[PDB]
Amino acid sequence: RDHFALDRPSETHADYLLRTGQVVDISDTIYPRNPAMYSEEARLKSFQNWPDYAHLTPRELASAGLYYTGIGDQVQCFACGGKLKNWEPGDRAWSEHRRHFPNCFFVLGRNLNIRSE
Ligand SMILES: [Zn+2]
Protein backbone atom coordinates (compact mmCIF):
# COMPACT_ATOMS: atom_id res chain seq x y z
CA ARG A 1 0.00 0.00 0.00
CA ASP A 2 0.96 3.66 0.37
CA HIS A 3 4.18 2.96 2.26
CA PHE A 4 5.39 5.77 4.51
CA ALA A 5 1.80 7.08 4.42
CA LEU A 6 2.40 8.42 0.89
CA ASP A 7 5.76 7.26 -0.50
CA ARG A 8 7.37 10.65 -1.24
CA PRO A 9 4.72 11.45 -3.91
CA SER A 10 5.22 15.21 -3.69
CA GLU A 11 8.67 15.93 -5.13
CA THR A 12 11.26 13.15 -5.33
CA HIS A 13 14.13 14.33 -7.52
CA ALA A 14 15.15 16.44 -10.52
CA ASP A 15 13.31 14.12 -12.90
CA TYR A 16 10.20 14.96 -10.87
CA LEU A 17 11.09 18.58 -10.09
CA LEU A 18 11.05 19.21 -13.85
CA ARG A 19 7.32 19.81 -13.38
CA THR A 20 8.27 23.13 -11.78
CA GLY A 21 12.01 23.42 -11.23
CA GLN A 22 13.07 22.52 -14.77
CA VAL A 23 16.71 21.79 -15.57
CA VAL A 24 16.67 23.44 -19.00
CA ASP A 25 18.55 26.70 -18.41
CA ILE A 26 17.39 28.78 -21.37
CA SER A 27 16.68 26.08 -23.96
CA ASP A 28 20.17 26.17 -25.46
CA THR A 29 22.26 23.61 -23.57
CA ILE A 30 25.44 24.75 -21.80
CA TYR A 31 28.03 21.93 -21.79
CA PRO A 32 31.74 22.79 -22.35
CA ARG A 33 32.91 22.68 -25.97
CA ASN A 34 36.37 21.46 -24.89
CA PRO A 35 36.55 19.64 -21.52
CA ALA A 36 40.26 19.11 -22.21
CA MET A 37 40.76 22.45 -20.44
CA TYR A 38 37.97 22.37 -17.85
CA SER A 39 40.40 22.78 -14.96
CA GLU A 40 42.60 25.86 -14.59
CA GLU A 41 45.67 23.63 -14.30
CA ALA A 42 44.86 21.90 -17.59
CA ARG A 43 44.30 25.26 -19.26
CA LEU A 44 47.89 26.07 -18.32
CA LYS A 45 49.15 23.44 -20.74
CA SER A 46 47.08 25.21 -23.38
CA PHE A 47 49.56 28.09 -23.19
CA GLN A 48 52.54 25.76 -23.63
CA ASN A 49 55.37 28.23 -24.22
CA TRP A 50 53.29 31.38 -23.74
CA PRO A 51 55.14 34.40 -25.26
CA ASP A 52 56.14 37.47 -23.25
CA TYR A 53 54.34 40.00 -25.46
CA ALA A 54 51.08 38.14 -26.27
CA HIS A 55 48.80 40.63 -24.52
CA LEU A 56 47.78 39.12 -21.19
CA THR A 57 48.81 36.50 -18.63
CA PRO A 58 48.34 32.79 -19.51
CA ARG A 59 46.83 31.75 -16.21
CA GLU A 60 44.42 34.70 -16.11
CA LEU A 61 43.16 33.42 -19.47
CA ALA A 62 42.48 30.01 -17.96
CA SER A 63 40.73 31.66 -15.03
CA ALA A 64 38.75 33.47 -17.73
CA GLY A 65 37.81 30.18 -19.39
CA LEU A 66 40.11 30.74 -22.35
CA TYR A 67 42.08 27.93 -23.99
CA TYR A 68 45.03 28.68 -26.26
CA THR A 69 44.85 27.06 -29.69
CA GLY A 70 48.47 27.77 -30.61
CA ILE A 71 47.25 30.55 -32.91
CA GLY A 72 49.66 33.29 -31.87
CA ASP A 73 47.87 35.61 -29.46
CA GLN A 74 44.42 34.28 -30.36
CA VAL A 75 42.49 32.75 -27.47
CA GLN A 76 39.05 31.13 -27.38
CA CYS A 77 36.52 30.14 -24.74
CA PHE A 78 36.27 26.36 -24.35
CA ALA A 79 32.86 26.63 -22.66
CA CYS A 80 30.56 28.57 -25.01
CA GLY A 81 32.95 28.75 -27.96
CA GLY A 82 34.15 32.31 -28.16
CA LYS A 83 37.30 32.95 -30.16
CA LEU A 84 39.01 36.34 -30.20
CA LYS A 85 42.01 37.59 -32.16
CA ASN A 86 43.65 40.95 -32.89
CA TRP A 87 43.75 41.79 -29.18
CA GLU A 88 45.06 45.15 -27.97
CA PRO A 89 46.84 46.59 -24.89
CA GLY A 90 44.27 47.34 -22.21
CA ASP A 91 41.52 44.98 -23.33
CA ARG A 92 41.20 42.50 -20.47
CA ALA A 93 41.45 38.90 -21.71
CA TRP A 94 37.83 37.96 -21.03
CA SER A 95 36.71 41.61 -20.95
CA GLU A 96 36.61 41.35 -24.75
CA HIS A 97 35.31 37.77 -24.59
CA ARG A 98 32.03 39.02 -23.11
CA ARG A 99 31.88 42.03 -25.43
CA HIS A 100 32.01 39.71 -28.45
CA PHE A 101 30.31 36.78 -26.68
CA PRO A 102 28.47 37.94 -23.53
CA ASN A 103 26.39 34.74 -23.43
CA CYS A 104 29.21 32.83 -21.72
CA PHE A 105 27.89 31.01 -18.64
CA PHE A 106 31.42 31.24 -17.21
CA VAL A 107 31.79 35.01 -17.57
CA LEU A 108 28.67 35.79 -15.54
CA GLY A 109 28.82 33.55 -12.47
CA ARG A 110 32.55 32.83 -12.99
CA ASN A 111 32.10 29.19 -11.85
CA LEU A 112 34.24 27.07 -9.53
CA ASN A 113 34.55 27.49 -5.75
CA ILE A 114 35.44 31.21 -5.28
CA ARG A 115 32.48 31.34 -2.89
CA SER A 116 33.53 34.11 -0.50
CA GLU A 117 29.93 35.15 0.18
ZN1 LIG B 1 32.78 31.80 -23.16
Curated annotation (Swiss-Prot):
Tissue expression per record: Expressed in colonic crypts (at protein level). Ubiquitous, except peripheral blood leukocytes.
Phenotype when changing residue 65 to E: In XLP2; uncertain significance
Impact upon substituting residue 73 to A: Reduced inhibition of caspase-3. May affect protein folding and stability
Post-translational modification summary for this protein: S-Nitrosylation down-regulates its E3 ubiquitin-protein ligase activity. Autoubiquitinated. Ubiquitinated by TRIM32; leading to proteasomal degradation.
Compartments where located: Cytoplasm; Nucleus
Residues spanning the membrane: none
Effect on the protein of changing residue 18 to A: Reduced inhibition of caspase-3
BIR repeats: 40-107
Outcome reported for the amino acid change (mutating residue 28 to A): Reduced inhibition of caspase-3
Outcome following mutation: residue 25 to A: Abolishes inhibition of caspase-3. Reduced interaction with HTRA2
Segments for region (Interaction with caspase-7): 18-26
Outcome of swapping residue 44 to A: Reduced inhibition of caspase-3
Associated disease: Lymphoproliferative syndrome, X-linked, 2: A rare immunodeficiency characterized by extreme susceptibility to infection with Epstein-Barr virus (EBV). Symptoms include severe or fatal mononucleosis, acquired hypogammaglobulinemia, pancytopenia and malignant lymphoma.
Subunit field text: Monomer, and homodimer. Part of a complex composed of SEPTIN4 isoform ARTS, XIAP and BCL2, within the complex interacts with SEPTIN4 isoform ARTS and BCL2, SEPTIN4 isoform ARTS acts as a scaffold protein and stabilizes the complex. Interacts (via BIR3 domain) with DIABLO/SMAC; the interaction inhibits apoptotic suppressor activity. Interacts with HTRA2/PRSS25; the interaction inhibits apoptotic suppressor activity. Interacts with TAB1/MAP3K7IP1 and AIFM1. Interaction with DIABLO/SMAC hinders binding of TAB1/MAP3K7IP1 and AIFM1. Interacts with TCF25 and COMMD1.
Family per similarity comment: Belongs to the IAP family.
Role summary: Multi-functional protein which regulates not only caspases and apoptosis, but also modulates inflammatory signaling and immunity, copper homeostasis, mitogenic kinase signaling, cell proliferation, as well as cell invasion and metastasis. Acts as a direct caspase inhibitor. Directly bind to the active site pocket of CASP3 and CASP7 and obstructs substrate entry. Inactivates CASP9 by keeping it in a monomeric, inactive state.
Entry text on domains: The first BIR domain is involved in interaction with TAB1/MAP3K7IP1 and is important for dimerization. The second BIR domain is sufficient to inhibit CASP3 and CASP7, while the third BIR is involved in CASP9 inhibition. The interactions with DIABLO/SMAC and HTRA2/PRSS25 are mediated by the second and third BIR domains.
The protein's name: E3 ubiquitin-protein ligase XIAP
Gene encoding the protein: XIAP
Residues of the full protein shown: 124 to 240 of 497
